[PDB]
């Protein structure tokens, strides 16, 4: 159980995170998130993205029954956090720091459609950042240095935390904007 955060040196909070916590240095929150608003740490679903895992249109919710609202997708629905190409630090906070296999970070394809439900066809399915977990328990907060590819405008980053001693992963999409 854990979520992408911006408490110390994280660049951008998860979509779900902003359902509960206000955005570092702007105050914005996401609204109408459903029951997951009480427990952003709980966006867990089946392993194996992208070959299996959460189906198209259910990637943002991970197929969670509490987080169905996260699968809504228009150009205006979600709070967008600024990012740039090049080095960036992503941050997870864990409420339960399970044994970890790895973390992987997907980015959307440049000319993805921001008004259709997220699918595999929306994402570059080669991750842009893979961090080894070494099948041990992380600390309660971690920072991951990643090189973010160049993009224009609104983009989504999927962060996947793959738990070493189950067949489940935690999926946090992040809404980012590469232009003001």
Using CB atoms within 10 A of its CB, is residue 36 exposed (0-12), middle (13-18) or buried (19+)? buried
Q: Which of 35, 96, 125, 130 binds Cu ion (CB under 5 A)?
A: 96
Taking the complex as a whole, the smallest distance from the CB of residue 53 to Zn ion amounts, in Å, to 10
168 binds, among Cu ion, Zn ion, none (CB under 5 to 8 A by kind): Zn ion
Using CB atoms within 10 A of its CB, is residue 92 exposed (0-12), middle (13-18) or buried (19+)? buried
- Tell me how far apart the alpha carbons of residues 7 and 10 are, in angstroms, rounded to a whole number: 7
Does position 120 interact with Cu ion (CB under 5 A)? The reply is: no
29 neighbors 74 (Cβ within 8 angstroms): no
Does position 1 interact with Cu ion (CB under 5 A)? The reply is: yes
Does position 35 interact with Cu ion (CB under 5 A)? The reply is: no
**In 64-166, beta strands by DSSP E:** 81-82, 86-94, 100-108, 123-136, 141-148, 154-163
96 binds, among Zn ion, Cu ion, none (CB under 5 to 8 A by kind): Cu ion
17 binds, among Zn ion, Cu ion, none (CB under 5 to 8 A by kind): none
63 binds, among Cu ion, Zn ion, none (CB under 5 to 8 A by kind): none
- 2 vs 127, beta carbon nearer Cu ion: 2
């Amino acid at each position: 159980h854990g979520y992408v955060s911006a408490v110390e040196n994280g660049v951008a909070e998860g979509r779900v995170t902003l359902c509960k916590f206000a955005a570092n240095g702007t105050g914005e929150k996401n609204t109408h998130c459903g029951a997951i608003q009480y427990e952003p740490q709980s966006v867990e679903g089946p392993d194996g993205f992208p070959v299996t895992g959460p189906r198209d249109g259910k990637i943002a919710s991970a197929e969670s029954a509490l987080a169905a609202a996260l699968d809504e997708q228009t150009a205006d629905r979600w709070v967008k956090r600024p990012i740039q190409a090049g080095p960036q630090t992503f941050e997870w906070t864990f409420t339960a720091n399970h044994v970890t296999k790895d973390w992987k970070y997907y980015i959307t394809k440049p000319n993805w459609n921001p008004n259709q439900p997220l699918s595999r066809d929306a994402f570059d399915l080669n991750p842009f950042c893979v961090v080894e977990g070494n099948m041990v328990q992380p600390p309660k907060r971690v920072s991951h240095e990643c090189i973010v590819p160049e993009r224009e405008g609104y983009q989504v980053i999927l962060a996947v935390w793959d738990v070493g001693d189950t067949a489940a992963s935690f999926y946090n999409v992040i809404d980012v904007k590469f232009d003001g």
